[PDB]
Amino acid sequence: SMEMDEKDFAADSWSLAVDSSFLQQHKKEVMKQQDVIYELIQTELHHVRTLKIMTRLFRTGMLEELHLEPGVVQGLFPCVDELSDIHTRFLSQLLERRRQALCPGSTRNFVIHRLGDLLISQFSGPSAEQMCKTYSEFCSRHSKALKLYKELYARDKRFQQFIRKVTRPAVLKRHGVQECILLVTQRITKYPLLISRILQHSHGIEEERQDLTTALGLVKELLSNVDEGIYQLEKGARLQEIYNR
Amino acid sequence: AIRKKLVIVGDGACGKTCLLIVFSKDQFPEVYVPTVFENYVADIEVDGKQVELALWDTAGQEDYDRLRPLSYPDTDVILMCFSIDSPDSLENIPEKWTPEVKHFCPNVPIILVGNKKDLRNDEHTRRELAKMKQEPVKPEEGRDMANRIGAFGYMECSAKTKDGVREVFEMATRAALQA
Numbered sequence: 001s002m003e004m005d006e007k008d009f010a011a012d013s014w015s016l017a018v019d020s021s022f023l024q025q026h027k028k029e030v031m032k033q034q035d036v037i038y039e040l041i042q043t044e045l046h047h048v049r050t051l052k053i054m055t056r057l058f059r060t061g062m063l064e065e066l067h068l069e070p071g072v073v074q075g076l077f078p079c080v081d082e083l084s085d086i087h088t089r090f091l092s093q094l095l096e097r098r099r100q101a102l103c104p105g106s107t108r109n110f111v112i113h114r115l116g117d118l119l120i121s122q123f124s125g126p127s128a129e130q131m132c133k134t135y136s137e138f139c140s141r142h143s144k145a146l147k148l149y150k151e152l153y154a155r156d157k158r159f160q161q162f163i164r165k166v167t168r169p170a171v172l173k174r175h176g177v178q179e180c181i182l183l184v185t186q187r188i189t190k191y192p193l194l195i196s197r198i199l200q201h202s203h204g205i206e207e208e209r210q211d212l213t214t215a216l217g218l219v220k221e222l223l224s225n226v227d228e229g230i231y232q233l234e235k236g237a238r239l240q241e242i243y244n245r
Numbered sequence: 246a247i248r249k250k251l252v253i254v255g256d257g258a259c260g261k262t263c264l265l266i267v268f269s270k271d272q273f274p275e276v277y278v279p280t281v282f283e284n285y286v287a288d289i290e291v292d293g294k295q296v297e298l299a300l301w302d303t304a305g306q307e308d309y310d311r312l313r314p315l316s317y318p319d320t321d322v323i324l325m326c327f328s329i330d331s332p333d334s335l336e337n338i339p340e341k342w343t344p345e346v347k348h349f350c351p352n353v354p355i356i357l358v359g360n361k362k363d364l365r366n367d368e369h370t371r372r373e374l375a376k377m378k379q380e381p382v383k384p385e386e387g388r389d390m391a392n393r394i395g396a397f398g399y400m401e402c403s404a405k406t407k408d409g410v411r412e413v414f415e416m417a418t419r420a421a422l423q424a
């Protein structure tokens with residue numbers, strides 16, 4: 001993550017991030033809504049950061065330092081560039097909505113009143129088709145990536161040294177290879193929980209309540225489609241095992 | 246310090262997310278209670294042994310039968326949660342959650358945890374449940390369910406007051422370390 005965004009999302013909540021004089025200007029319900037939107041953007045910033053650890057720290061480090069067989073790095077990190085493109089674009093839209101809402105003279109005081117339309121756009125049309133295609137592929141290669149990682153860590157000395165080296169700093173404590181893979185897989189199922197809680201505090205403007213209701217429906221449709229399109233790939237699995245599924 | 250993995254399972258209203266948040270911060274949130282939990286690696290020393298215990302939530306995966314088992318690989322201990330204010334969450338333990346965990350995590354110890362124990366003597370809780378001919382889960386009903394499902398043990402806690410929370414994760418660490 002870049003320092004500007006880390007600092008903007010350093011506080012435990014929107015109510016702790018904005019100046020107390022600005023917080024006092026809002027009703028309780030608006031504060032509750034803003035605290036949940038802030039959690040959605042803050043967890044999205046962290047998810048994009050998890051994808052950068054996978055592409056830049058792990059993947060690129062293995063390509064530039066290790067001598068792994070061809071197709072090994074792809075097997076360890078399936079669809080990471082496509083996932084990073086989907087979420088970096090979605091994060092950019094969320095952060096631009098926050099930036100446009102800032103009060104003149106402030107880099108922390110804002111209120112986001114129109115999130116629903118942004119979520120409908122993200123979870124419909126070509127962007128939803130790409131999210132569905134990418135997560136169905138990634139989640140079907142999850143078991144295979146974990147097994148390939150375990151084999152390499154236990155048999156390749158230079159691979160073990162590389163992993164121990166790049167995961168040694170305290171800031172990588174929660175972000176080893178297998179941990180990043182599960183963080184990414186679990187990301188999509190966090191959206192309905194966050195969207196439903198934002199909806200609970202967005203009844204003040206009927207158009208906003210309707211937009212978040214449509215977005216929650218679209219996210220659930222995407223999740224059902226991804227869940228139905230998953231079948232774990234297994235290295236060396238025979239055709240007979242597959243057609244007898 | 247050896248690395249161990251913990252996964253918490255149970256119905257959406259069992260309080261698993263809150264339990265992981267309160268343990269990881271050693272505090273019930275004073276300003277904002279988060280909607281979600283990402284992951285955490287807790288440094289725990291139990292009976293003189295140092296462990297790094299990675300914590301994972303399954304909240305949001307309850308309706309997705311092909312996404313949810315992706316959380317299980319290499320789990321060392323399962324926390325199977327129910328809410329003491331919800332006898333319906335306890336009923337879903339033996340033939341929904343238990344067969345799933347025994348299939349994807351064979352031989353992994355299961356600790357049955359009764360969450361929200363502070364609501365056992367709550368008047369609003371007792372009045373609400375009585376409308377559906379129900380009452381808060383009794384300690385003996387919890388112990389009997391744990392015995393029935395072959396759980397390693399039965400424990401209770403309150404994420405609200407923190408009572409019993411440290412003991413749950415210290416016992417889960419002990420269970421993860423066993424042969």
Ligand SMILES: COCC(=O)NCc1nc2ccccc2[nH]1
Nearest residue numbers: 015031032033035036275276277
């Ligand atoms: C006890 O502290 C007073 C306070 O102001 N809390 C902020 C706050 N309270 C929330 C409730 C629901 C959703 C989001 C919320 N955000």
Ligand SMILES: COCC(=O)NCc1nc2ccccc2[nH]1
Nearest residue numbers: 267268269270271272407410411
């Ligand atoms: C109910 O909690 C009991 C417990 O032992 N929690 C672990 C724990 N202790 C911490 C201290 C500082 C920061 C984070 C911490 N996390």
